[PDB]
């Protein structure tokens, strides 16, 4: 779990909030979507999860 408490936590949260990926919808339109959909300006914390362990999760494996 990452805690967004405090000034540092607010900055970390903003970094996650700023993370996005663009998808091309079937009509050809580009939709931006946030990676951390769960996180927002109201979210106090979040949790990464992986049953084979987080070293098996691509985002940390890399």
């Amino acid at each position: 779990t990452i805690h967004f408490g405090g000034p540092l936590g607010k900055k970390i949260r903003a970094n996650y909030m700023a993370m996005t990926f663009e998808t091309v919808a079937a009509d050809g339109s580009i939709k931006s979507e946030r990676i951390f959909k769960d996180i927002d300006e109201n979210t106090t914390s979040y949790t990464f999860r992986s049953p084979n362990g987080l070293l098996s999760a691509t985002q940390f494996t890399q």
Binding site: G5, G6, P7, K10
Partner: protein, 49 residues
């Protein structure tokens, strides 16, 4: 969230700070109750006697 910006001082006093000489006022009102009570009680007790 505000407290993470700066320390917060919440006045939940209900305005007691605006009463001058709170102890004297309190002592006087405690007297006022007692006098009224005593007078009726003395009359009651005398009526009984």
């Amino acid at each position: 969230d505000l407290c993470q910006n700066e320390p917060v001082c919440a006045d939940l006093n209900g305005g007691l700070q605006f009463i001058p000489n709170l102890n004297e006022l309190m002592t006087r009102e405690r007297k006022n109750l007692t006098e009224t009570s005593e007078i009726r009680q003395a009359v009651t007790k005398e009526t009984a006697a």
